[PDB]
Amino acid sequence: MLFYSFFKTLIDTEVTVELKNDMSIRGILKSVDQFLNVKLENISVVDASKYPHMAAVKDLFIRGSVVRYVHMSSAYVDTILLADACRRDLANNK
Amino acid sequence: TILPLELIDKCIGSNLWVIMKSEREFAGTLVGFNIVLKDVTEYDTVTGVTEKHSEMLLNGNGMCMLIP
Amino acid sequence: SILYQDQRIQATFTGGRQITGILKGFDQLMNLVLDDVEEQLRAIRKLGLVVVRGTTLVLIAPMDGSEEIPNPFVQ
Amino acid sequence: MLPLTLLNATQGRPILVELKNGETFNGHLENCDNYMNLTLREVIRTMPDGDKFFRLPECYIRGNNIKYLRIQDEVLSQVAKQQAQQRE
Amino acid sequence: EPLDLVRLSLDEIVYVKLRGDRELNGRLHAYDEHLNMVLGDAEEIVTIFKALKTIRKHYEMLFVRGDSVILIAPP
Amino acid sequence: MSLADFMEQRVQVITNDGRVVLGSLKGFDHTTNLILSDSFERIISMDQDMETIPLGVYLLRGENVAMVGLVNEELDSEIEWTKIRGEAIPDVVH
Amino acid sequence: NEFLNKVIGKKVLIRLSSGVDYKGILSCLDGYMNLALERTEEYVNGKKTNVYGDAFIRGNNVLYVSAL
RNA sequence: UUUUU
């Protein structure tokens, strides 16, 4: 539940999801679930001239198994609290 | 009829040939069960490169067929 | 199990390998024990009696009545 | 509508199945399970390049290899109606 | 117990080798049992094919999904 | 799922083999299997004009789903998809 | 799985399905075949390409571990 | 046997 809880905290902030098909999609995180399925709103595909297929899509669901990275600005991430949460996560499941 | 796990169990101590879904093979004498094989020769069936190993734990996820 | 004993069937595996053989036994993991199995290469080679791992099957069909046909559909 | 309710409701009717290897199968779906494993009857199997064709009296397809299924519109219509009958 | 190795790298710099000829160097701030990770101040190296070129990118903060990860080591 | 937000609406699926199929989302489940009705595929190319293939009712296995986008009808109405060229979407490689 | 005791603490070969090999002293193994090695050397096309001082290898990539 | 490959 550690990274699902974290992603819940990045909701309403801007992320870029790079997929295992090498597309990267930028948008406002609106939802994330236990599988790390993710919903982005107001997406813009990074290399839109390569890929006009999504020229009419504003709200977008990305399946969790196809994410390579989700990368985001450090401004909305507290890395000590994240690290503490992690230490407490691996203590709990131990 | 025939029972698969009983068949490999028949093979403990015997020579077993295991062929993966990729075009790779191993042939050696079976030690136990992911499988542990003894004195196995691994065959790359495309490049033809063959190499032998004295004993190895071979991951089971990629094995296709077992042949006594 | 949604599923021939001692009748000949063909089976195809993930990764592309495709074999034929007469079904002589099975269990519920869909392990198969098939003999006089021969895999058709991508020409054939014959593997003798093989136990097939149920997790790798994609397709099992009976051989009796499977045939190559010309285009049966509309142009 | 759950995808498995539609698949279960298409038992006994025609179905087109395309597998990851690109082959497609046209036949009557007689049965399926909750893994999406299928057994079909009276099938035409078409190889990936549309090159070669086989007729199969019946066939079993393990669900983990399916890319997609095509189902008649009336099956979906029948199920929508049935779910709309079950509410009252 | 294998994971204890990466447990010792929390808040330290790691090298991550990924499927697809990609490599990351960053500060490990979190991970789980799949090796999902969040790396801070990360550099990505992509090798493009003897290699034809490599492309380096920097990420202020970067989550990496565990199923692409091949190995994790000190830098 | 976040997919409950797309129910009964025009949806655009990008599959793991790079295909684009549009349709009304009639249902989904926790592995992301989908029912689309009145669906069709779009084949965008660089060499040739966009192709549209009718597909009818389409059940998609979740293992093969990369993205599900909500199609904005006004924005999509604004686009002349016939004269659109673009690169092939890559396959997802796991 | 008495292979483990026989092998833990000695040099091992991990061949990944990708074909890259890693040799080093084996610290640890687990049920999914995740590995910890103590001074890993990496080999591509058979040539040494990198050496890592300790390595965690995710088991899904390991095709086999062979003894030294 | 579909989301930790």
Numbering used by the authors:
A (entry chain B), F (entry chain H): 1 to 94
B (entry chain E): 4 to 36, 41 to 75
C (entry chain G): 24 to 26, 31 to 69, 79 to 111
D (entry chain D): 1 to 88
E (entry chain C): 9 to 57, 66 to 91
G (entry chain F): 6 to 73
Text of the article:
Eukaryotes possess eight highly conserved Lsm (like Sm) proteins that assemble into circular, heteroheptameric complexes, bind RNA, and direct a diverse range of biological processes. Among the many essential functions of Lsm proteins, the cytoplasmic Lsm1–7 complex initiates mRNA decay, while the nuclear Lsm2–8 complex acts as a chaperone for U6 spliceosomal RNA. The Sm family includes the Sm, Lsm (“Like Sm”), and bacterial Hfq proteins. These proteins share a conserved “Sm fold” consisting of an amino-terminal alpha helix followed by five antiparallel beta strands that form small beta barrels that assemble into ring-shaped hexamers or heptamers. Here, we elucidate the molecular basis for Lsm-RNA recognition and present four high-resolution structures of Lsm complexes bound to RNAs.
We crystallized the Lsm2–8 complex bound to UUUUU-3′-OH and UUUUU > p and determined their structures by X-ray diffraction to resolutions of 1.9 and 2.3 Å, respectively. In contrast to the Lsm2–8 complex with unmodified RNA, the structure of the Lsm2–8 ring bound to UUUUU > p reveals that the last nucleotide is highly ordered. The cyclic phosphate causes the RNA chain to make a sharp turn of nearly 180°, which positions the terminal nucleobase to stack over the last histidine at the carboxyl terminus of Lsm8. The terminal uracil base adopts an unusual syn conformation and forms a hydrogen bond to the Lsm3–Asp83 side chain. Lsm3–Arg27 forms a hydrogen bond to a nonbridging oxygen on the terminal cyclic phosphate group and makes a salt bridge with the Lsm8 carboxy-terminal histidine carboxyl group. This binding mechanism is markedly different from that in the S. cerevisiae Lsm2–8 complex with a noncyclic phosphate, where the terminal uridine adopts an anti conformation and lacks direct contacts with the corresponding arginine and aspartate residues. We find that Lsm2–8 binds tightly to an RNA oligonucleotide with a 2′,3′ cyclic phosphate group, and fourfold less tightly to the unmodified RNA with a 3′ hydroxyl (Kd = 26 and 100 nM, respectively). The 2′,3′ cyclic phosphate group bends the RNA chain around and stabilizes an unusual syn conformation of the terminal uracil base. Quantum chemical calculations of 2′,3′ cyclic UMP indicate that the cyclic phosphate stabilizes the syn conformation of uridine to be significantly more favored over the anti conformation. This syn conformation of the terminal uridine facilitates stacking on the Lsm8 carboxy-terminal histidine and allows for a hydrogen bond to Lsm3 Asp83, which could not happen in an anti conformation. The carboxy-terminal histidine residue of Lsm8 that stacks with the terminal syn uracil nucleobase is also strongly conserved in almost all eukaryotes.
